[PDB]
């Protein structure tokens, strides 16, 4: 069910050395920067980005870096990453790439300065892939009247690793296909298991290699030492991105980083505390049942201690919304291993249903457990729409519904600023 | 509070002569025991990485050529580290070897193991969390003086504790190398990485995990088709030893997870009936210190250990001694309430042996009451011995530093899970 190579969504932008696979993401901690990324296929080209605000109309130049990689017998084109800095808040910018030969122009709008009541609408997309289902989900997202301003992407991007030798051409197609969204609004990247691409049989033993060359993240801005875990702040939200497939034992870099990062969160500046990871800690579907248990034993108690509002994950190709529950009272021999209602705990949402390679996960463990509020095996996407420091509205849209139809929706009451039972 | 041996202690003396090799240490260099990695440091100049070696019988002297490396850690600059692999050795024979051939030569010896086989006896020492306190020295002394005669040390992690010093003062890696040489220059120590080897110190711009340890202690990880030094397998006599990394990734689909799943399928109990796992952090631990830190890895690998009938899992990290019953806790399914360990005669025994001395502190606070899964636990310094007699029987003993070197405060017969799975409860 993967879209054929000649699909319209995979068309090559015309013109000699025209930039393609253009994508942007936040480039700093607070929203004044953007990483601009693209690929040129005919020759290295310039890594310069020309950009200007609509407000001041002053054309500026930022210089970046070009890189290449190989994977088995695949050789990449020329990958460009350029960080535009010192941007004004809440301002429309135009930017151009391909300054030496064929120039292409895009735009984005910077977020407002971080603050207590700053509204912002986040899209939720996971396990996207490049099937016709993937295209429908992307269409529904961009047609949504809630108007997403940034996608929180919970992992499993291209599924290129399903192809012979992970045929990395399917990374190039995915980049051309997603450009119509991510060239104009940031996607916040989480690494999933299809990004691991550990393939010792063809001597590719470096985890996350193609993904890490193609998708950069501002990980140094939160004093992380690795691209696979990091934080950003945007509007009223503090977003923590974790790596299900990296080390998280006590004392490891990721564990150390997260422990310190949670102490740095200021709910008086960013009231909405959001965690992204690929593998869900709470999941009542058959597929990947209990894979999240290892990270849960390490980090669940911290999520409760710090009153995380919501944890988004993918991996399971379906939709699930938990109750606020915790399973943190276990001590090996005390028998306390059943999740209980816990209003201090986040809501766990699985949103890995954007299409993958066309397969939905319909097998559910029955009956629906007490910890699960709502689950359905349909393709779709989410929207987390912050109104102010106390209220955020989450909605789930199905591909088989109208683009303005929400099959599930719930009001989030903030755990720090308004801890009322939002059951 | 500071019980570390002072820099001028006799165990830290520098071998005399210009560029004399120091911190000499060996470990198995291949999968089956026909090779040895020879390692050492020269301090005055790079020197030669050549190793001269010969058996005590035929006496034909050969040269193996190795590689030199250096590293920096903050304001520390290492000396010149040599690693050289001697290959194609004969089984069960004594070899002499010489390092420092350019200037000051020093000579040592080792005895290769017998060829792997079903009924091959072999005596393994167990040492965890050694450190360089006076307690550490006593433990090493007790091991060297054992009447049972250890032939290889299985070391379950936390080596030098240099990371406790300001800027992890890597001089304390050098001292530890000189201190331990009296043992490890003559018999292999099998290295497991512990949390004191991570040395993740972003505050001083040292962010490469395991850097000083991995420069100083090499392992034959390619021999078992691992892509990382931090997890690997070796076979020695009748034992198949799997070394895991508590502080590397082990999620589904990760390199270590993938490697272990495939490696367990390669185990042949008719060739190496004793299946032994090493890791730093214990999956079963009834002490307060580090209680339940092993849960995450336990969720991933415990069921595999039972499926493959691992005989024993050795760990350190807790600075005390513990021996579990044969139990498993693998039946949990979130909502089925099955989260209590049960007797399980396919399961390994879990032994915590992280009590060789560290920086001088014992972990004495225990979970009360002693849980059913715990057979024996005691907060004393000491070390262990896993003495394989044959394919059905291995004798494990625990010697305390406060006792005579021949006294075993705890001991138990292991009955092999493949050839003789009798209840061997204490
Ligand atoms: C924070 O955002 C909430 C969601 O928009 C606000 O609630 C909404 O307030 C409207 C009046 O401004 C009201 O018609 C809507 O029904 C309501 N939506 C709900 C409750 O889901 C909230 O407004 C405060 O709380 C509500 C319950 C009323 O008491 C309002 O008068 C309050 O202003 C916003 N909080 C603010 C603005 O402080
Ligand atoms: C493997 O080694 C075991 C320990 O040395 C052997 O058991 C010991 O056998 C002695 C002489 O047969 C006997 O005096 C000891 O009591 C006994 N030790 C223990 C702890 O049981 C074992 O020998 C077999 O097993 C024992 C239990 C008897 O049935 C013997 O008759 C058997 O030969 C060795 N097993 C082998 C070589 O297969
Ligand atoms: C993908 O969806 C877009 C927007 O609905 C449509 O124009 C395009 O033809 C689709 N391409 C496919 C399904 O290959
Ligand atoms: C890579 O190798 C496969 C065979 O394993 C072949 O079919 C494919 O065309 C090769 N691709 C390139 C770009 O050489
Ligand atoms: C490294 O810095 C420490 C702390 O300032 C100092 O005591 C030590 O002598 C230094 N080591 C060097 C410069 O080799
Ligand atoms: C360490 O132990 C050895 C052997 O028991 C002894 O000769 C030496 O003096 C000790 N060194 C210390 C305690 O510093
Ligand atoms: O083999 V002779 O140099 O002691
Ligand atoms: Fe997926
Ligand atoms: Fe220790
Ligand atoms: Na699974
Ligand atoms: Na996992
Ligand atoms: Zn996945
Ligand atoms: Zn430890």
DSSP labels, B39-63: EEEESSS----EEEEEESSS---EE
Q: How far, in Å, CA of A381 to CA of A141, rounded?
A: 7
Instruction: Name the percent of chain A in helix, strand, coil, to the closest 5.
Output: 20, 30, 55
Q: In this complex, is the C-beta atom of B340 within 8 Å of any C-beta atom belonging to chain A?
A: yes
Domain B117-426, architecture per CATH: 4-Layer Sandwich (3.60)
With CB atoms and an 8 Å threshold, state whether A253 touches B333. Answer: no
Residues B287, B377: Cα–Cα separation, whole Å: 9
Describe the strand order of the beta sheet including B22-28 as a list of residue ranges.
B22-28, B36-42, B80-86, B67-69
* Shortest CA gap B76–chain A (Å): 22
Separation of alpha carbons B272 and B255, rounded Å = 25
Mutation pick for ligand 5 pocket among B7, B76, B167 (CB with most ligand atoms within 8 Å)? B167
Q: Is A115-423 assigned to CATH 3.60.21.10?
A: yes
CATH 2.60.40.380 domain span(s) along chain B: 20-116
> CA A268, A274, A278: angle at the middle one, nearest 5?
160
**Between chains, do A253 and B227 touch, taking CB under 8 Å as contact?**
no
From the list B292, B300, B339, the residue facing A294 with the nearest CB is: B300
Distance A6 CA to ligand 3 centre (A): 12
Q: Which chain A residues are within 8 Å of B247, Cβ to Cβ? A: 247, 249-252
Q: Is A221 on the interface with B (CB under 8 A)?
A: no
Q: How many CB pairs under 8 A join A and B?
A: 110
- Which structure tokens are listed for B311? 């005989």
Which chain B residues are Cβ-neighbours of A291 within 8 angstroms? 251-252
Q: Strand ranges (DSSP E) for A323-378?
A: 325-326, 340-341, 347-351, 372-376
Confirm or deny that A401 is annotated as ligand binding. Answer: no
CA distances from B225 to A243, B99, B193, B272, B327 (A): 25, 29, 18, 19, 31
Strands ordered across the beta sheet of B189-191: B189-191, B152-155, B122-127, B382-388, B393-400, B410-415
CATH architecture entry for B20-116: Sandwich (2.60)
Give the tokens for residue A190: 């989480």
Provide the 3-class DSSP secondary structure of residue A181.
helix
Q: Is B317 annotated as a binding residue?
A: yes
Q: Flag whether residue A293 sits within 8 Å of chain B, measured between CB atoms.
A: yes
Contacting residues of B for A245, CB less than 8 Å apart: 249, 251-254
The CATH number of the structural domain formed by A18-114 is: 2.60.40.380
Q: Which residues contact A14 (CB under 8 A, 6 or more apart)?
A: A102
Domain with CATH 3.60.21.10 in chain A: 115-423
Disruptive mutation site among B227, B252, B372 for chain A (greatest number of A CBs within 10 Å): B252
E strand spans, A299-371: 310-313, 319-322, 325-326, 340-341, 347-351
Give the CA radius of gyration of chain B.
21
A7 CB within 6 A, ligand 3: yes
Which sequence positions of B are flagged as catalytic?
Answer: 290
Show the tokens assigned to B358: 């560290």
Q: Which residues of B touch A290 (CB under 8 A)?
A: 299, 333-334
- The residue among A219, A230, A330, A333 with the most chain B CBs within 10 A of its CB, best to mutate, is A333
Q: How far is the CA of A175 from the centre of ligand 10 (A)?
A: 29
Question: Phi/psi class of residue B127: alpha, beta or left (left: φ > 0; alpha: ψ in -120 to 50)?
Answer: beta
Residue whose tokens read 């580290």: B81
Give the sign of the dihedral formed by CA A83, CA A257, CA A278, CA B243: positive
Residue among A306, A207, A187 at smallest CA distance from A258:
A306
H or E element, residue A71: strand A70-71
Q: Give, for ligand 1, the residue of A120, A272, A388 to mutate: max count of ligand atoms closer than 8 Å to Cβ.
A: A388
Nearest CB partner across the interface for B251, out of A225, A245, A331: A245
Residue with tokens 């440091």: B41
What are the b/e assignments for B160-196, b being 16+ CB within 10 Å? Answer: bbbbeeeebbbebbbbbbbbbbebbbebbbbbbbbbb
Side-chain half-sphere exposure of B1, counting CA atoms within 13 A: 1
Ligand 3 pocket test, pick from A7, A9, A128, A140 with the greatest ligand atom count within 8 Å of Cβ, gives A9
Q: Is residue A39 within 8 Å of A77, Cβ to Cβ?
A: yes
How far apart are the C-alpha atoms of B406 and B402, rounded to whole Å?
11
| Residue A127 marked as a ligand binder | yes
CB A276 within 8 A of CB A258: no
Reported resolution, Å: 2.0
């Amino acid at each position: 069910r993967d879209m054929p190579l000649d699909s319209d969504v995979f068309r090559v932008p015309p013109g000699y050395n025209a930039p393609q696979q253009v994508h942007i993401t936040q480039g700093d901690l607070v929203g004044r920067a953007m990483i601009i990324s693209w690929v040129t296929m005919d020759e290295p080209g310039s890594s310069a980005v020309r950009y200007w605000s609509e407000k001041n109309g002053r054309k500026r130049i930022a210089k970046g870096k070009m890189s290449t990689y190989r994977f088995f017998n695949y050789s990449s084109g020329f990958i460009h990453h350029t960080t535009i800095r010192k941007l004004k808040y809440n301002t429309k910018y135009y930017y151009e790439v391909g300054l030496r030969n064929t120039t292409r122009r895009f735009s984005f709008i910077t977020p407002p300065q971080t603050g207590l009541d700053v509204p912002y609408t986040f899209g939720l997309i996971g396990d996207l892939g490049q099937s016709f289902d993937s295209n429908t989900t992307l269409s529904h997202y961009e047609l949504s009247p809630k108007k997403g301003q940034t996608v929180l992407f919970v992992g499993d991007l291209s599924y290129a690793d399903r192809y012979p030798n992970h045929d990395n051409v399917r990374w190039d197609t995915w980049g051309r296909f997603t450009e119509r969204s991510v060239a104009y609004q940031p996607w916040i990247w989480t690494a999933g298991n299809h990004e691991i691409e550990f393939a010792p049989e063809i001597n590719e033993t470096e985890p996350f290699k193609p993904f890490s060359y193609r998708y950069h993240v501002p990980y140094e801005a939160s004093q992380s030492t690795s691209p696979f875990w990091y934080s950003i702040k945007r509007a009223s939200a503090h977003i923590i991105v974790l790596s299900s497939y990296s080390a998280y034992g006590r004392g490891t870099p990721q564990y150390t980083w997260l422990k310190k990062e949670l102490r740095k969160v200021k709910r008086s500046e960013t009231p909405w505390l959001i965690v992204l990871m690929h593998s869900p800690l709470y999941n009542s579907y058959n597929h990947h049942f209990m894979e999240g248990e290892a990270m849960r034993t390490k980090f669940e108690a911290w999520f409760v201690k710090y009153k995380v509002d919501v944890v988004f994950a993918g991996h399971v190709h379906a939709y699930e919304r938990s109750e606020r529950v915790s399973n943190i009272a276990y001590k090996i021999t005390n028998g306390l291993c059943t999740p209980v209602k816990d209003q201090s705990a986040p809501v766990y949402i699985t949103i890995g249903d954007a299409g993958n390679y066309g397969v939905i996960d319909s097998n559910m463990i029955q009956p629906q457990p007490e910890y699960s509020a709502f689950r359905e095996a349909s393709f779709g996407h989410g929207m987390f729409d912050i109104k102010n420091r106390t209220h955020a509205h989450f909605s789930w849209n199905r591909n088989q519904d109208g683009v303005a139809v929400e099959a599930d929706s719930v009001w989030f009451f903030n755990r720090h600023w308004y801890p009322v039972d939002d059951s």
